[PDB]
């Protein structure tokens, strides 16, 4: 069955709440597994302590940066980057979980959660999950964003793991 992961989100360290995600391992196993393992930290690096550094109201919340030797921008569990697995799933509405990238076949650790349908990203970003619980928390996060994405307070992943 598809795995579920959670983030406990904080705002300048003050707990906001939990967002849980279903990861579509049945459709994008490699991409789901990357996010899953980064969420548990089992490879020795991952999302715990990272921030949502780009939050654009009415669009998406992006995070997944963390420090490693050749960068501060995060990396996958397969070495630095990996290929776009497939584009089966679309950015159909709020709660979609999808990979950030720097063009084709540049998936690392960065991801975003859509707060709206973003169909212009279909075929450009690999959708691999969706918000299960805590969409209210994502909406709360969104209110700390801005039009250029800069956040007005530090939105962090205080804890994360697998449910």
């Amino acid at each position: 069955v598809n795995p579920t992961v959670f983030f406990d989100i904080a705002v300048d360290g003050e707990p906001l709440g939990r967002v849980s995600f279903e990861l579509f391992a049945d459709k994008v196993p490699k991409t789901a597994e990357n996010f899953r393992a980064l969420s548990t930290g089992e490879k020795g690096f991952g999302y715990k302590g990272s921030c949502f550094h780009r939050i654009i109201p009415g669009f998406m919340c992006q995070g997944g940066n963390f420090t490693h030797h050749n960068g501060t921008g995060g990396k996958s569990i397969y070495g630095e980057k990996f290929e776009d697995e497939n584009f089966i799933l679309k950015h159909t509405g709020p709660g979609i979980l999808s990979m950030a990238n720097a063009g084709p076949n540049t998936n690392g650790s960065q991801f975003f959660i859509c707060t709206a349908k973003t169909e212009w990203l279909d075929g450009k970003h690999v959708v691999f999950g969706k918000v299960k619980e805590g969409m209210n928390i994502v909406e709360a996060m969104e209110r700390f964003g801005s039009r250029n994405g800069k956040t007005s307070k530090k939105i962090t992943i205080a804890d994360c793991g697998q449910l």
Partner: peptide, 6 residues
């Protein structure tokens, strides 16, 4: 830059 807004 992050996913494009359009």
């Amino acid at each position: 830059p992050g996913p494009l807004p359009a």
